[PDB]
């Protein structure tokens, strides 16, 4: 921070008497079920050796967990998302720039814990006929415990470029009915993948044997809104100040699969079965400030 | 703080009634996946003895987890980031200094714990023949308990200097599927390294038997988001006020390698096998109060 | 505070309406390889009834963890920083006196933990051939815990006068490899000290088996950053406004040597066997309200 | 608070548009080693029906951990601080009043829990011969637990009156080498009072045998850095506006003696060997709104 | 709050643009020990229907934890602050009310836990002549586990009515040396009550067998200091525009005794012994806005 | 929040360039036991589209916790609240409406642990006859279990309607000298209800064994503080601008009565045997912004 320099707080920080032209464009992929929302603000700042943009994605992208086939009582998929998707990109004849961004990847921490224990006990024994008996004993143990936490999705971003940003929302791993947690390679040799196995040899068919979504993660089935932020810097002597973007919003989707066998169920999951892509090109307008279609 | 010698909050901090001049300057370094941002602050406090400007090293530098080679289905190799490092330097005839930086190296803690505990038990023990018996005994142990928070990565400032500065980001350890920590060190007769290693026996080509990158920390692969601050002083009476800096960014790779053995899979890691180098200089103009490539 | 006896928030504090006159020196000591920083700030309150000048060492005094010594591959010595050193004096002609000082000492705490339990059992035994047995028993146990934080480094202010201050930043304890904590003074007969072991009987070169400085506390090797704070008080009327003062940076070293005799290392530890010290003199002018080396 | 009876905060705290005359007074008790620094803050609020002097005691007063006697190689003393005391105090002839004090007692808390376990168990066991037999058992068990924080000094406010007031910080215990705690009336009728014993039975100078400072409290060695305020009131119908105000700095020292019985070290602590005091006189000039000594 | 009913922060305060004439009256009694302050705050705010007083009761009662009587060396008495009360009484005839208080009473509240346990255990065992036996076993274990926190002291708001407020600080109980806690209603057939016993057979004089002051509550000698507040409205329009207001304070006081009977020493508590009360009367001049002894 | 939908903090607040009317009105039931305090606000605000008015209901409903009837030495009865009620309400002619409250009823967590440990054990025996012995054995265990607070009292915001709202503070359990917790329908055999039992098998009289209201919850003795707010909407263009409220405290008093038997005490609960009620209307002039009783 500003403070740690000896820095009086928010001195280094852009926005200080300057105007800003905020914007909102709104968009519903009805046949993707992606909301699509990008919230814009245009900052020129005469103390700023550039144009900036600030770009915010929101929205809504549909999980859409549901069972979209049946092969008879004793066979049924389910079709679920592991991973949504947002993406940026600037055409590479721009001379616009892609200078800063977030969410950025975080470090992850672990709590370690080591036990040393030892210990001495004695007794001593009796009975009617005078037999009379001790024992003496000692013990060590030596214990490692790890502890951190696991979220149900994850929140990545792509390794940037000044032309294109992205961040992916993948499924790490979930809890199922207490059990678990399960992920998309989760396997033994028995029940195979017991992702979305609602009961392990339940007789009912197999489109009703699978995890109810108000079970699992609401992101599974509501979906997932994404939050993400980037800046875009244009210099102020450029002779075109017309920009194009591309936004794009993306479901990859897995293919969960409940099979009777013989005697119990048995689930296989296949990954990145569908991909929905749902593209979108805006103009920005540097010398008018706005964002458009 | 200031008021704990009692004083108000922010008086001894620099940047009261000043204007400053901020600018950002972005490069992609393509060939070694670097996203580099500087963003600048001048300032010019009059009250303060020197003129000021704040570098904020930013970007990202790109992981690249990969599989690099692949000698048939018993052999393969994985490339991964060990340390990613920034680098700031002053050439040696400038008058400029470096005079404060940030983050600095934190002292870390661990959570000690010693337990005593002692214990009387005793009991009748008899039978339909009429054989009564019983026992006495008594019990003590001590216990020793260790706490403390391992990161995936640490953040280390390397000793800095009046012309250099220095930051670097070095895997610590990680978890691999609930097992572990494993460092680059570690090491079993039958498996030897188990860093990267997705399972012990099975049957598979070498190159599918690497941990899958959404399992591992995110640094691996998408990369890593350096936030580093330097300050440089520079005198307002210097004859030449012109500056010259150079700006590294450095990528350590390691080599891990699998091989089948006869029966099981081993890992092997090989340390700074690769060192990806992006260097740029910069030239400051403190009359003018900008910097340009 | 001063709403604790119903007063206004900094009412009572210094720098109301005043200003306030800021400045940096910086120093590079190559052969004691110590950064130094001194942030200075003068304030003359109106209000107040004398003349404050508020000094911040900083910088950064380098670890220097290194193997200095080899003598064959059976002996090898370590010299590592167990102690870092800040000190500011007034010669003892001068009116100016120190007044105040951050950081300061504190009160450490533990958490104690009493357990008292009490349990009754009893169990029903047969076989075959009709023998019934029965045994009543019961126990009673007492616990006591201890928890209290245990730093790497302690940071510790030394008795101040009204003519020099001090701190030191000591070496604890540290962790190895999950094992200890180990201390300066930790010893067993088999293998001495094993602060900076690696391996307790591996068969390599004395200079590989020293821990790994990423493994280490990262002030042992990249060293320790000041951040201290003094404030000197001179008075308004006094015949000369002219005062120096020292400050003094200091590492304290220790030489740690592996030895192999016949089946496993053995550590040994020698406190304080060097001790690099960097003076350095500053001329304040009150009248002026600078500071000059 | 005031906002927990419907009253805008700070509404009714003293200090506003007021002019604040601060001033600080430090001396150095050298043959004591005290550094006793007294800042002051005279408000005079109209609205307020008193004239108000915020008094505050800071400085250092030192431990002086020291090794005082030792009568050969069997028998040594060490001189420790068991009690830092900080007093104001007006004569009795003054109209002057001591109206708030801070700090101030706080009520202690610890945490209770009770624990109720039952269970059952049940097994059978058989050999090759046939023999088959069972168990049926039942327990339960009755726990409880007591937590709380213990502080190594304890901060006190000795009971205040309008002329005088006073604060305490004692010792309450410390751990020895993870041992203890121990405070001053531990006793064990073996080893005595183990409070700063080194080691049970080593062999060693017996002046060579106590704890190392840098191991125990920092308060018993470097010292103790009182922050205590306290607020005089003054009527302003007052025909005399001089007052005069004694602060005492107070240090009291326990005797800590090792001997080396035939076969191990016995310690033996004597509390309150010793008293420091160092008195100083000040002048309050009300109408002038300034203190002297 | 106001932010949860859409309204901004303060807006229904009382106290905007208001001048509050703030004072502050000290008392000390001798023969109670008790430093009595009262301060007061008169609002008249032109947007409330009343004039409001804002009276806060603060200083200190001093607990006098003192051993009282010795008859010889087998008998002992101990007198004990149990109880710490403040008051505030308006008399009858008067038309000011009292309209608000603070602290008032709090919900408390604790935290269940429930455990619930089953386990399966199987062994083999054999010999040397060939004798081959096993054992199969099954548990289950059900607990319950209550946590929650038990000051030293309570502090409870009595019924107040429009005419007097009150509180109550009493002594709920206490640890004896990581003993207990003990209550003024412990007792056990052997030792009785041992809420102040030092040693439970010690041989010494009754007199020195009582718990030394610094190893209990604070609040047991030094004593407490009150923090409450109230608030009296004042209609604009009543005849007579003066009050008279009752402060008491008041402190009740335990006799401990310890007797030695023949083998141990035998503790009893009797409850309120004594009770020493402190009134203070005081003038409300509203017109004025000042208050007077 | 605001900044949740890219809106500047208090955006959307009430309350904005407004005078607010604030007053309070106070009333002592003396019949009833009950302080109560109305705190009322008047917001006409330009950009809203009604006239607001918050009360804020206020003051103490005495606990009343005591015995009330002795039947002898064998036969005693407690009264005790069992809840505490505030009710607002309009009649059905007003055109005034309730639009908002607080608080409301929050959505209750727990806390989820499941655990599943597996191990093997294995030893060897022997004696000084040669015998040798041993044993290998393995153990599987699943726990699960479950955390939560249970407060005392539970605070309920019971259905509103526009013309009416309530709020009720019911008792929820209670620890009895560490013991329990016990409710309202806590029953055994033995002793059937311990809610307030102070001994089980205590030989005194039947009003002597009631828990002592110190060791049990204040708000059953000393008594509740409400602090609840409605917000009640007044059209601008409505004919009458005159408004009446009325307000409503109430409290339900349960009988626990203690009974001998022949060998221990036995505890009997009925339920909601008493309730007082406290109705108070109100005059609310929406002109004059002004309330009255």
Do not use: C
Request: no cysteine; proline share 3%.
């Amino acid at each position: 921070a500003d403070s740690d320099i000896n820095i009086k707080t928010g001195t280094t920080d852009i926005g200080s008497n300057t105007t800003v032209k905020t914007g909102d464009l709104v968009t519903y992929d009805k046949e993707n079920g992606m909301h699509k929302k990008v919230f814009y603000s245009f900052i020129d700042d005469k103390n700023h050796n550039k144009k900036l943009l600030v770009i915010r994605t929101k929205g809504t992208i549909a999980g859409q967990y549901r069972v979209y086939s049946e092969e008879g009582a004793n066979k049924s998929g389910l079709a679920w998302p592991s991973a949504f998707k947002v993406q940026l990109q600037l055409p590479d004849n721009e001379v616009a720039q892609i200078s800063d961004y977030y969410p950025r990847n975080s470090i992850d921490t672990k709590e370690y814990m080591s036990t040393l224990t030892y210990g001495f006990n004695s007794n001593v024994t009796g009975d009617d006929t005078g037999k009379i008996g001790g024992l003496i004993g000692a013990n060590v143990s030596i214990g490692h415990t790890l502890r951190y936490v696991q979220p149900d999705f994850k929140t990545i971003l792509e390794s940037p470029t000044d032309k294109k940003v992205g961040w992916k929302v993948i499924f790490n791993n979930m809890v199922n009915q207490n059990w678990g947690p399960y992920d998309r390679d989760s396997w033994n040799p028995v029940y195979g993948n017991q992702l979305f196995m609602k009961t392990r040899n339940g007789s009912m068919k197999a489109a009703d044997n699978f995890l109810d979504p108000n079970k699992a993660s609401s992101l599974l089935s509501s979906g997932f809104s994404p939050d993400f932020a980037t800046v875009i810097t244009m210099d102020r002597k450029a002779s075109k100040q017309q920009t194009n973007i591309d936004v794009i919003y993306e479901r990859v989707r897995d293919d969960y699969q409940l099979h009777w066998t013989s005697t119990n169920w048995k689930g296989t999951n296949t990954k990145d079965k569908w991909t929905d892509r749902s593209s979108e090109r805006y103009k920005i307008d540097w010398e008018k400030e706005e964002m458009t279609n």
